[PDB]
């Protein structure tokens, strides 16, 4: 199948309490594999998946140097943005960045992306062409004009089409048993009365990977979102995910309702009925 590598970072200023807190994590699809935390004692990039541990000490030296270098950029940018927005020195602010690349089944580059946020709102994003930017407001337009003039997108594009893809290809093989798997949802329905006249049907999906799933309720084969409810997909803690969807129904009409489950690991979508 197709796959992604993504790096996420969060820098939080702490005025009058030292350097910003910087935390970075790397993922291949929905599997985390590295972390760095500027408050931790090691001051190293650290493994967070079994299949990255085999990388040799040169790898960890490289990842540590490069994640620390990004943390220095972000610390200076916290000051710059405080200035762009004419904000006080007293307040804590956050810069978040996510970038990544996607490959197909044969490892060919599909697409790259990079997005930046300030205080949890869009700040600047690389466009899908990997050649130009979209700024969210007048401050980010300063950054846009600067990065355009410096041809910065060219360096990012070279990473996203090049290094990014090569390393993702490698991780997919070294971590094949974990990363090239699809675990289909184990599904079941529960049924309980709410009262004399209504019952709850709950449709469960357990133990699935990757996290992407769709749970749909239908009524006489026609889509139904009136009187339904679904929880956010959640991690089980062991590398699989859980989700459920429920519907409140008139007692005696359970037969009309169907739960439909779509997941990459199912040859065919499932239909569950009570």
């Amino acid at each position: 199948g197709s796959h992604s590598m993504r790096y996420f970072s969060t820098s939080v200023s702490r005025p009058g309490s030292g350097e910003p807190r910087f935390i970075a994590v790397g993922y291949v699809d929905d599997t985390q594999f590295v972390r760095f935390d500027s408050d931790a004692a090691s001051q190293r990039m650290e493994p967070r998946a079994p299949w990255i541990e085999q990388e040799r000490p040169e790898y960890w030296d490289q990842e540590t140097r490069n994640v620390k270098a990004q943390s220095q950029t972000d610390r200076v940018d916290l000051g710059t943005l405080r200035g762009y927005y004419n904000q006080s020195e007293a307040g804590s602010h956050t810069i978040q960045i996510m970038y990544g690349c996607d490959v197909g089944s044969d490892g060919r580059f599909l697409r790259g992306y990079e997005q930046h946020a300030y205080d949890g709102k869009d700040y600047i994003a690389l466009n899908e062409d990997l050649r130009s930017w979209t700024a969210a407001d007048m401050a980010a337009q300063i950054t846009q004009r600067k990065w355009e003039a410096a041809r910065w997108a060219e360096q990012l594009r070279a990473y996203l089409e090049g290094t990014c893809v090569e390393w993702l290809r490698r991780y997919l093989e070294n971590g094949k048993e974990t990363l090239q798997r699809t675990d289909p949802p184990k599904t079941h329905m529960t049924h309980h009365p709410i009262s004399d006249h209504e019952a709850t049907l709950r449709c469960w999906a357990l133990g699935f990977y990757p996290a992407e799933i769709t749970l749909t309720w239908q009524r006489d084969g026609e889509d139904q979102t009136q009187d339904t409810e679904l929880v956010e997909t959640r991690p089980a803690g062991d590398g699989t995910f859980q989700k459920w969807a429920a519907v409140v129904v008139p007692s005696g009409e359970e037969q009309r309702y169907t739960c439909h489950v779509q997941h990459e690991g199912l040859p065919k979508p499932l239909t569950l009925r009570w």
């Binding site: 790096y7 970075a24 790397g26 590295v34 990039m45 790898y59 490289q62 990842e63 490069n66 994640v67 270098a69 990004q70 950029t73 972000d74 200076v76 940018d77 710059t80 943005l81 970038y99 930046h116 600047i124 300063i142 950054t143 600067k146 990065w147 410096a150 910065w152 360096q155 990012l156 990473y159 290094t163 990014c164 390393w167």
Partner: peptide, 9 residues
């Protein structure tokens, strides 16, 4: 592997 480059805003 993380991107080795970054540019200030």
């Amino acid at each position: 592997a993380i991107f080795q480059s970054s540019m200030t805003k």
